[PDB]
Amino acid sequence: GPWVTTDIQVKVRDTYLDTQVVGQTGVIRSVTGGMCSVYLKDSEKVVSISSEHLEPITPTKNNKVKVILGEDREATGVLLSIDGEDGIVRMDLDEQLKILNLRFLGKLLE
Ligand SMILES: [Cl-]
Ligand code: NA
């Protein structure tokens, strides 16, 4: 299913109509029918943007993360380390480490 979810950092792709918004970063704060309300950091404004114009920003070490794909989607944690293509995440619910390919992880900015 979809990857978009609340509170993750995204970049606007070149299928969005407004050239001034293409390439900007923001954070999803709501999702309704495949439209996301994205708070754009540079322009300091919200825009309603179809999910299919977005891409997740890959998290780095010490970012909080929210799983966006697979069985653990919506679970949160902290990215402790990157080993190649895999992230090592301390999961918030049980405090245990879990290995997830980085493509499974959104950067959580609450
Ligand atoms: Cl749109
Ligand atoms: Na969409």
What are the domain boundaries of the chain? 1-56, 57-110
CA–CA dist 96, 49 (Å, integer): 35
- Name the resolution in angstroms: 1.1
Residue 100: which of 60, 74, 72 has the closest Cα?
A: 72
Distance 34 CA to ligand 1 centre (A): 10
CA 33 / ligand 2 centre spacing (Å): 8
Whole-number Å distance, alpha carbon 52 to ligand 2 midpoint, is: 4
Amino acid at 64: K
Paired tokens of 78: 């902290």
3-state secondary structure of 50: strand
For this PDB entry, the determination method is X-ray
Q: Residue 102, SS3? A: helix
